[PDB]
Amino acid sequence: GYDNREIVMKYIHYKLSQRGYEWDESEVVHLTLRQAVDDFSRRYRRDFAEMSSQLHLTPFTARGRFATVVEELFRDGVNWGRIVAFFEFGGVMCVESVNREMSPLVDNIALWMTEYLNRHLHTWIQDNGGWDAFVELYG
């Protein structure tokens, strides 16, 4: 079986590696997330750009910026497309944190993503076929 913390960390680890940064099953789910983000990058690029816009990051504003974006994303409900977008957003925040010399924020972002998944997303995933439902389509 999977671990939500493992999934978040593999995804962030991958997105940092893409941009040339070294940091530090759940694997199949992480690979599924990469496939789904790639897919959405070819079709929902404006929506991804609009979420990542207004990312002005400082260590004392990082959490509030994360919370505002993710709370707007899920305020009127959860679907699989919003879960994909949540991963894309957290990844972008992690690479922007490294680009702007705020590399201590990467593990905080991984923690906020892990807590948010577990407290606000996990029951929806479980009620709607588990990670398997998602892996079945994009795996």
Binding site: R43, D47, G77, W80, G81
Partner: peptide, 11 residues
């Protein structure tokens, strides 16, 4: 949910 993003129309 109320569609506010293009991916909402697929779900």
């Amino acid at each position: 949910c109320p569609a506010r993003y293009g991916w909402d129309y697929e779900c």
